[PDB]
C-alpha cells in the first residue's frame, strides 16, 4: 500500500518483495556427547593426566547439573504439575523449558540404561543398540585425536612426552568448552541455545552431529544459519562425564497476507547539497498495516526472510504518513561523505542524481542534466535507449508509470541529525527553547 | 580552528593530531583455491567419503555459481554494455561489481585452460606454468593434513579407521566454510568481502595466501588490519571444485588540507558533583569545516587514520558553537561511577581535578587545591616544578598559554542524560509539557 511513485523522488527506490516465515512446532532427536576420551590403548603412559582432567570436568558440569536439577525435583506427574512455591521465581520461557525437561526423562531413562556400553565406547562416532526401546548415537570428544595421532606413536615418543601431549590436547579442549559450558551459561534450562554452541562439546564439528542425525537439503542450511535449530541439555552424568542433548527440528510456518518490502536509497538534492531520506529499509506489511522489522536478526534469502521468532515492532504515525504519500513528513540527513550511492536500477529504469554524477546519453552523445527543481532524475528508454553513468554503460527499459514523472515536484520534510552526540544535543536545545517560552506565556497570562 | 583554551576548562584536553587517508584505485592478482584435497596416495582406503564430500560441496557452491552467473549472461561487448532489463533490479555497488566480473573473464578463461593440471595437483601450495599467457598459483585445502598426518599411517591404522579420520577432517573443514560460503553469503557479486573471510577456503591461513602473492612491508600490515584488502569470486568450477579469486591491492590516498584531532576527557566540577562534557572524541577537520567521523570502523595508527571508505558524517550547529568557543552550548553528564579519569597530561602540563583527587606539590610539600570556582585546575612548572597526584610523581613542563588560566571562569552548558531508557523518557517529558502549553496559548488567544 506504499506510494512508490512519491517515494522514488524522495530517494527510496522499490526493491525486492520477499515472503515472511517464522520457526514453530519442532520434532526431536536425542544424542549423547561424551566429554572424556577413551585412553585404554595407551593406558600404559597417561601419568596422572586423566585424573586431573576428570576433576576439572566435574567442576564445570556440577553447576549445570545442579541448576537443571532444581526444575527436576519440583515436578510430579498429574500431564505434569509443576510446583510454583518450589521454583518460586521464574519467567514464562523458563517455565516452559522446565516442563519439557520433565517429559524428556522418558527417553533419558532409557538412554541411561545403556551407560555400561556408553562408558566403554572407543570411537569418535558410534551407534549403540540393544532394543527397540533403547538405541542411541554417541559422539566422543577427542577420540580421533587419540587413536590417530597419539596411539600410533607410543613406541616412538618417550612416555613422558606422550603424557605431555595428551595433557596439552585436553587443556585445549577445556579452553574451548569454557566459552559455552563455563559459568557464562548461567541458565542451562532454557532451550534457546543453538546447535553451533552445543557442538563445541564435540570440537565445534556441528556437521558431524547433524549429519549423524539426519540428511541434507537446501532448506536445512537455511534453518541452520537462521539459528532455528537449537537444543537442550536434559541429563548430566557426573560419573561418566556425558550429557544427553535434545535437538529440535522446526517446521517453518509462513504468515498469510504478509510480506517484506525492501527500499534502495539514492541520495538526492533539494537545494545546493546532497541529502538522504531516512526510512526503515525493510518494511513489514501484514494485511493493511505497516510495521517495522528487526531484520538484522533474520536470515535474508532471495525469496524470503526466515526468523527464529516474531520480530515485528511498532512504528510511529508520521512514518505511516511518509510511506503512504504525505512525504512532507519524511525526515532527511545531510550528505558529507563521498561514499553515498547516487543511483539505483529498478525494473530496467534508472533513478539517478545527475547534478553530482556525470550522466550522458550514449545513443546520441547528448548530455543528460538535472535542473535544481528535481530531486532525482528518472531515465528510461523512451528518452534515451541506453545511457552512461560515470564509466558504466546500461541499456534501459521503459518506465511503466507516469509519463511526465520528471516534470513534477514533491514536498520535502525537515533536516535531521542521527549521531549519538547530536541526539543528546538536540534534546538539550529543544528543552532550553521550551523552558524560555513557558516563562513568556506566564507574562502573557498575568498582564 | 578549535578553541583549545576554552575546551580545556570544560574538560577536553587537546591530544594527538593524525593524518587522514582512504583506500582507492587497486591493482589486482588472481589466485586459485581448490576446496577438495588430492587423495590418490591413499586411494586404497577412502571408502565412500569423498563421494559424499563432493555432493555437499556442490550443494554449497551451486548457489554461488548461480548467483554470480546472472550478471554474466546479461552483458555483451560493446567497453561493455550491461543489460538493464536483464538484471532488472540492482544497486550501484552491485552494478559496478558486475562489470568487474565481466572484464575479469579474460584471465579466468586463460586459467580455466589449465584445469587439467589444476585437477591433478598434489601439494598444499603449487605454481602452475605453461605459457606467458597462462600461469597461476593454486592453493589446496587440507592437502598437508592428508600427506603429513594420514598417508604415513596407512600401514598402522586399519583402513576403516583411516576412512573415519578423513571423514572427520572433511566435516570440520565444511563446518568452517559454511560460516562464509554458506547461505549467509547471499550476494557473491559484490567485492567488499575481506581477504580474511576468503581465506577460510584454505583453512583461514591468510598469511600463506598473501605471502604467496606478494612480500611484506609495515604498510601492508596496516592495510590488512584496516580491511582495505578484499577480493571477488570470479569463477566457480563445479566439476573440479575450485574457485578463482581476484585479490585487490589498494593505493592509499591522503586527503589534502585535512586532519583528525582527538580530545582527552577529564571530569570536572561545576558545583558539588563531578561532570563529563560530551563531545565527539575525534573531530575531523577539512579545510575550514568540522565534521564527525565514524572512526570505530577505521584503523588508528600513531600517525594516521586509515579507512577503507569515506566515513565523514554531519554535525549540528550547536556542536560547532561548542567547539569554536561558545561553551555555553556544550552539554554535560553527571558522574556516578568511580571509574571516570580525573586528570590528563598535555605537552608537559597537567589538567586535573583537585577537589576529588589528592594533589600536592612535591617540590615544597605544599598542598595544591581547587576552589569551587574552577572546573579543572591547571598545574605546570612555573607554580610547581614537580607534582604528585595520588601516588604518581610527574615532573612538569610550562604552560605556553595564558598566564592567569586558573583565574578565569567559563560558561557551562546544561545537564543531559544519554541512556537508552532515559532518552525515551526525556522525549515523553518534553512532549507532555509542550502539549499542555499548546492549550494555554489557545486560552490566551480566545480571551
Amino acid at each position, epitope marked *: 500500500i506504499l506510494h512508490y511513485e512519491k517515494l522514488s523522488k524522495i530517494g527510496l527506490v522499490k526493491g525486492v518483495t520477499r515472503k515472511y516465515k517464522i520457526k514453530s512446532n519442532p*520434532l526431536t532427536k536425542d544424542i549423547v556427547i561424551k566429554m572424556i576420551p577413551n585412553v585404554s590403548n595407551m593406558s600404559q603412559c597417561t601419568g596422572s593426566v586423566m585424573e586431573n582432567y576428570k576433576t576439572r570436568l566435574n567442576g564445570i558440569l556440577t553447576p549445570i547439573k545442579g541448576a537443571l536439577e532444581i526444575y527436576k525435583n519440583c515436578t510430579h506427574d498429574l500431564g505434569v504439575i509443576m510446583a510454583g512455591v518450589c521454583i518460586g521465581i521464574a519467567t514464562a520461557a523458563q517455565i516452559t523449558a522446565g516442563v519439557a525437561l520433565y517429559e524428556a526423562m*522418558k527417553n533419558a531413562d532409557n538412554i541411561n540404561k545403556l551407560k555400561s556400553s556408553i562408558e566403554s565406547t572407543n570411537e569418535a562416532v558410534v551407534k549403540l543398540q540393544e532394543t*527397540a526401546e533403547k538405541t542411541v548415537y554417541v559422539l566422543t570428544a577427542l577420540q580421533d585425536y587419540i587413536n590417530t595421532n597419539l596411539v600410533p606413536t607410543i613406541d616412538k615418543i618417550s612416555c613422558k612426552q606422550t603424557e605431555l601431549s595428551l595433557d596439552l590436547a585436553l587443556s585445549k579442549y577445556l579452553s574451548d568448552l569454557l566459552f559455552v559450558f563455563g559459568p557464562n551459561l548461567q541458565d542451562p534450562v532454557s532451550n534457546s541455545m543453538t546447535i553451533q554452541a552445543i557442538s563445541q562439546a564435540f570440537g565445534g564439528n556441528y556437521e558431524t552431529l547433524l549429519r549423524t542425525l539426519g540428511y541434507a537439503t537446501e532448506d536445512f542450511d537455511d534453518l541452520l544459519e537462521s539459528d532455528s535449530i537449537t537444543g537442550q541439555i536434559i541429563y548430566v552424568d557426573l560419573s561418566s562425564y556425558y550429557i544427553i542433548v535434545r535437538v529440535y527440528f522446526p517446521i517453518l510456518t509462513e504468515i498469510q497476507q504478509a510480506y517484506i518490502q525492501e527500499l534502495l536509497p539514492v541520495s538526492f538534492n533539494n537545494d545546493n547539497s546532497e541529502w538522504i531520506s531516512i526510512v526503515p529499509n525493510f518494511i513489514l506489511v501484514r494485511n493493511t498495516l505497516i510495521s517495522n522489522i528487526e531484520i538484522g536478526f533474520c536470515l535474508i534469502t532471495k525469496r524470503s526472510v526466515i526468523c527464529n521468532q516474531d520480530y515485528a515492532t511498532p512504528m510511529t504515525n508520521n512514518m505511516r504518513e511518509c510511506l503512504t504519500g504525505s512525504t512532507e513528513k519524511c525526515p532527511r540527513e545531510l550528505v558529507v561523505s563521498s561514499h553515498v550511492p547516487r543511483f539505483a536500477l529498478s525494473n530496467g529504469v534508472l533513478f539517478a542524481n545527475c547534478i553530482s554524477v556525470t550522466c550522458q546519453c550514449q545513443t546520441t552523445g547528448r548530455a543528460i542534466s538535472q535542473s535544481g527543481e528535481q530531486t532525482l532524475l528518472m531515465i528510461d528508454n523512451t528518452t534515451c535507449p541506453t545511457a552512461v553513468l560515470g564509466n558504466v554503460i546500461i541499456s534501459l527499459g521503459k518506465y511503466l508509470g507516469s509519463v511526465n514523472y520528471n516534470s513534477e515536484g514533491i514536498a520535502i520534510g525537515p533536516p535531521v541529525f542521527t549521531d549519538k552526540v547530536d541526539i543528546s544535543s538536540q534534546i538539550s536545545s529543544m528543552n532550553q527553547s521550551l523552558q524560555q517560552s513557558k516563562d513568556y506565556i506566564k507574562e502573557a497570562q498575568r498582564l | 580552528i578549535l578553541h583549545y583554551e576554552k575546551l580545556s576548562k570544560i574538560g577536553l584536553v587537546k591530544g594527538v593530531t593524525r593524518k587522514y587517508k582512504i583506500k582507492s584505485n587497486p591493482l589486482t592478482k588472481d589466485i586459485v583455491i581448490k576446496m577438495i584435497p588430492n587423495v590418490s596416495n591413499m586411494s586404497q582406503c577412502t571408502g565412500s567419503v569423498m563421494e559424499n564430500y563432493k555432493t555437499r560441496l556442490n550443494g554449497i557452491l551451486t548457489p554461488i555459481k548461480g548467483a554470480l552467473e546472472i550478471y554474466k549472461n546479461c552483458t555483451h561487448d560493446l567497453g561493455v554494455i550491461m543489460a538493464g532489463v536483464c538484471i532488472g533490479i540492482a544497486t550501484a555497488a552491485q552494478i559496478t561489481a558486475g562489470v568487474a566480473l565481466y572484464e575479469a573473464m579474460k584471465n579466468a578463461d586463460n586459467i580455466n585452460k589449465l584445469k587439467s593440471s589444476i585437477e591433478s595437483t598434489n601439494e598444499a601450495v603449487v605454481k602452475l606454468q605453461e605459457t606467458a599467457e597462462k600461469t597461476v598459483y593454486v592453493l589446496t585445502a587440507l592437502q598437508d593434513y592428508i600427506n603429513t598426518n594420514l598417508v604415513p599411517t596407512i600401514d598402522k591404522i586399519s583402513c576403516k579407521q583411516t576412512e573415519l579420520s578423513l571423514d572427520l577432517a572433511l566435516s570440520k573443514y565444511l563446518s568452517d566454510l559454511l560460516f562464509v560460503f554458506g547461505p549467509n553469503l547471499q550476494d557473491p557479486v559484490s567485492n567488499s568481502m575481506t581477504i580474511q573471510a576468503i581465506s577460510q577456503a584454505f583453512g583461514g591461513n591468510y598469511e600463506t595466501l598473501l605471502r604467496t602473492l606478494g612480500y611484506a612491508t609495515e604498510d601492508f600490515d596496516d592495510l590488512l588490519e584496516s580491511d582495505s584488502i578484499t577480493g571477488q569470486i570470479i569463477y566457480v568450477d563445479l566439476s573440479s571444485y575450485y574457485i578463482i579469486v581476484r585479490v585487490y591491492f589498494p593505493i592509499l590516498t591522503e586527503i589534502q588540507q585535512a586532519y583528525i584531532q582527538e580530545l582527552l576527557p577529564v571530569s570536572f566540577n561545576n558545583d558539588n558533583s563531578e561532570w563529563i562534557s560530551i563531545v565527539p572524541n575525534f573531530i575531523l577537520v577539512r579545510n575550514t569545516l568540522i565534521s564527525n567521523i565514524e572512526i570505530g570502523f577505521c584503523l588508528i595508527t600513531k600517525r594516521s587514520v586509515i579507512c577503507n571508505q569515506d566515513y565523514a558524517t554531519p554535525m549540528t550547529n550547536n556542536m560547532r558553537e561548542c567547539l569554536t568557543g561558545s561553551t555555553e552550548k556544550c552539554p554535560r553528564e553527571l558522574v556516578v561511577s568511580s571509574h571516570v579519569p580525573r586528570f590528563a597530561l598535555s605537552n608537559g602540563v597537567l589538567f586535573a581535578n583537585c577537589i576529588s583527587v589528592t594533589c600536592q606539590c612535591q617540590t615544597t610539600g605544599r598542598a595544591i587545591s581547587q576552589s569551587g570556582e574552577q572546573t579543572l585546575l591547571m598545574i605546570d612548572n612555573t607554580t610547581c616544578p614537580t607534582a604528585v597526584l595520588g601516588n604518581v610523581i610527574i615532573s612538569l613542563g610550562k604552560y605556553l598559554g595564558s598566564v592567569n588560566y586558573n583565574s578565569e571562569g567559563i560558561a557551562i552548558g546544561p545537564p543531559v542524560f544519554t541512556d537508552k531508557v532515559d532518552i525515551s523518557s526525556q522525549i515523553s517529558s518534553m512532549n507532555q509539557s509542550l502539549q499542555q502549553s499548546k492549550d494555554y496559548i489557545k486560552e490566551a488567544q480566545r480571551l
Partner: antibody
Framework: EVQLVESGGGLVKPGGSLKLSCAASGFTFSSYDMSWVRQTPEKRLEWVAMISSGGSYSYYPDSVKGRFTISRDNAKNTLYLQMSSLRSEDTAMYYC???????????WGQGTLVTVSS | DIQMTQSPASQSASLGESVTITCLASQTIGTWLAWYQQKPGKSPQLLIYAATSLADGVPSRFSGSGSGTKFSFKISSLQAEDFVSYYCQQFYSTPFTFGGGTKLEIK
C-alpha cells in the same frame, strides 16, 4: 489445487529401460522437494527416490541406488525418473509425490504403471 | 533400516463403531511418524503427520497419538466410506519405509 500428473509408463522387457515423467501444476515447483513411491501388486508401498528442492542432493534405497536416476527441470516444472536394468521385481504403480517439510507425502498424483515381462 | 509392524492386518467393525490400529517400530523414532488412507483405484492421502497433527481437510473422526516405539490410530465413529486401507510410515531417517498396511471390513 495441486495436480501432479505422471506419464511414461508401459511394458519393458527385463534388462530394459524406461523414462518416467511427472508434470506439476498449481504450486511452485521450485519450492518443494519430491519423490517417487512405488506400490506393488500386493499393495505394499516402497520409497523409490527423492530429490531435494534445488536438485543438489538426492537419495535412494539400496535396491535402486546405482540403477535409477532422479532429476528435475525446474523451468519445465517437471520431475523425472530414469529407470534402468529393469527386473520383474520392479512391476508396480509409480507415484509422483510432493513432500512436506520432512518426508511425509502431502500430495500424490494418480500414478502410472510399469510392467516388466519377457 | 527402520521397519515397523502394523496390526491387526484386518479387523471388522459395525458402522458407527470406534476402531484402532497399531504400528510398532523396530527402534525408537520419536514422533517422526505419519499415517495414510487409501481408497480403491486411487493414490494414498495423508491424514496424520508428525504423529499427532491432522492434515488439512481431514475430518474430526480421525485422530492419533504415540511416541517412541509404539504408535496408534483411531477412528472414533466409523463410516461406510472409511472401510478402506490404512498405512503408517516413518520419516525419522532414510530409507523411509512403510508398514504392511491394514484393512477394515464390515461385520
Amino acid at each position: 489445487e495441486v495436480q501432479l500428473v505422471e506419464s511414461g509408463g508401459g511394458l519393458v522387457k527385463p534388462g530394459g529401460s524406461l523414462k518416467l515423467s511427472c508434470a506439476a501444476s498449481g504450486f511452485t515447483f521450485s519450492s518443494y522437494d519430491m519423490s517417487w513411491v512405488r506400490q506393488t501388486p500386493e499393495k505394499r508401498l516402497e520409497w523409490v527416490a527423492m530429490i531435494s528442492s534445488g536438485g543438489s542432493y538426492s537419495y535412494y534405497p539400496d535396491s535402486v541406488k546405482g540403477r535409477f536416476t532422479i532429476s528435475r527441470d525446474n523451468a519445465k516444472n517437471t520431475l523425472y525418473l530414469q529407470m534402468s536394468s529393469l527386473r520383474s521385481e520392479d512391476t508396480a504403480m509409480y507415484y509422483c509425490a510432493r513432500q512436506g517439510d520432512y518426508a511425509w507425502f502431502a500430495y500424490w498424483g494418480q500414478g502410472t504403471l510399469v510392467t516388466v515381462s519377457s | 533400516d527402520i521397519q515397523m509392524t502394523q496390526s491387526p492386518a484386518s479387523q471388522s467393525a459395525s458402522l458407527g463403531e470406534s476402531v484402532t490400529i497399531t504400528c510398532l517400530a523396530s527402534q525408537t523414532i520419536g514422533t517422526w511418524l505419519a499415517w495414510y488412507q487409501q481408497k480403491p483405484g486411487k493414490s494414498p492421502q495423508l491424514l496424520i503427520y508428525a504423529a499427532t497433527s491432522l492434515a488439512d481437510g481431514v475430518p474430526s473422526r480421525f485422530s492419533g497419538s504415540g511416541s517412541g516405539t509404539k504408535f496408534s490410530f483411531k477412528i472414533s465413529s466409523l463410516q461406510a466410506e472409511d472401510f478402506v486401507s490404512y498405512y503408517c510410515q516413518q520419516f525419522y531417517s532414510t530409507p523411509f519405509t512403510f508398514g504392511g498396511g491394514t484393512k477394515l471390513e464390515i461385520k
